[PDB]
Amino acid sequence: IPPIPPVDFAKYGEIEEVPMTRLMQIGATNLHRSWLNVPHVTQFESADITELEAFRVAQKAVAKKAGVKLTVLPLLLKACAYLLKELPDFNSSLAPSGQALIRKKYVHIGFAVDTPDGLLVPVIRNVDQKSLLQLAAEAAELAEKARSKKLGADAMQGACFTISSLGHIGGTAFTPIVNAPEVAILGVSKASMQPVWDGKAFQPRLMLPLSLSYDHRVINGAAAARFTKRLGDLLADIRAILL
């Protein structure tokens, strides 16, 4: 690939050099490797989380009594786990012959934590088997270790899918980069109140913005519009996971 020409930036004014951490340089290399290998598409969708939200908030006592704080991330992790098992191509990786998929029969999901040193993506194993408060607690531990540079490489390995949530900061949607060799990543932006047509009139519903990026070699456009659709359906009534 042609390089970018160097510019003497100091011809235009004062400059200062600050160096990158090795975490950032590792990070920079991997993103560029994914960017060039994965033909990326993003599928946007909004889920109605009005009821999910009222549930989250009523279980505040139970969570506090268990010592965990129940955020939106365990609810996202449970639902993507159920779906990664209904739609197995999302839980797979392209074999290096490029002529096969390796479908994983396990569901371990990573989630992005932004730390001062750079980006880390701890992994929760067998998300499909843990409960909302187990996932709430584990998520919080991995993120605290991650921030304290006390996370060990063992826990950054073998994920099947990544959730990257910026809802806690803002924005309307974004286009995340697939964390190759995985095949998809969910971005979650900020929920806001919205008018949704009910057949007769517009009702305020709390809408969550989802941005699924996928490896289009492996997932076609209709499989991914169906993944965001099923996820929107599950988050609108999480009891369907019971079925």
Ligand X SMILES: CC(C)(COP(=O)(O)OP(=O)(O)OC[C@H]1O[C@@H](n2cnc3c(N)ncnc32)[C@H](O)[C@@H]1OP(=O)(O)O)[C@@H](O)C(=O)NCCC(=O)NCCSO
42 contact choice in a copy of itself, ligand X, none (CB below 5 to 8 Å, kind-dependent):
a copy of itself
Residues 48-87 that bind a copy of itself (CB under 8 A): none
Assess contact for 232 and 207: CB atoms under 8 A: no
188 contact choice in a copy of itself, ligand X, none (CB below 5 to 8 Å, kind-dependent):
ligand X
Considering the rule CB under 8 A, would residue 93 count as an interface residue with a copy of itself? yes
Residues 23-52 that bind a copy of itself (CB under 8 A): 24-25, 27-28, 31-37, 39-46
**Residues contacting ligand X: total by CB under 6 A:** 18
Active site residues: 216
Shortest-Cβ-distance residue relative to ligand X: 167
Considering the rule CB under 6 A, would residue 214 count as an interface residue with ligand X? no
Binding-site member from 30, 37, 71, 134 for ligand X (CB under 6 A): 71
Q: Which residue has tokens 């949530």?
A: 165
Q: Which residue has tokens 């999901």?
A: 109
| Main-chain phi, psi angles of 167, to 5 degrees | -50, -35
As a dihedral over the C-alpha atoms of residue 163, residue 168, residue 170, residue 176, rounded to 10 degrees, the angle is -10
Per-residue contact string for residues 104-133; x = within reach of ligand X by CB under 6 A = -------xxx--------------------
Using the rule CB under 8 A, give the single segment among 49-57, 61-69, 75-83, 156-164 that binds a copy of itself: 156-164
Distances in Å between the alpha carbon of 40 and those of 71, 101, 134, 212, 216? 29, 18, 33, 10, 6
Considering the rule CB under 8 A, would residue 119 count as an interface residue with a copy of itself? yes
Helical (H) or strand (E) element with 80: helix 73-86
Distances in Å between the alpha carbon of 39 and those of 54, 101, 139, 179, 183? 39, 16, 30, 12, 11
Q: How far, in Å, CA of 188 to CA of 154, rounded?
A: 26
Please report, as ranges, the residues that interact with ligand X according to CB under 6 A: 71-73, 111-113, 139-140, 143, 163-165, 167-168, 188, 190-191, 208
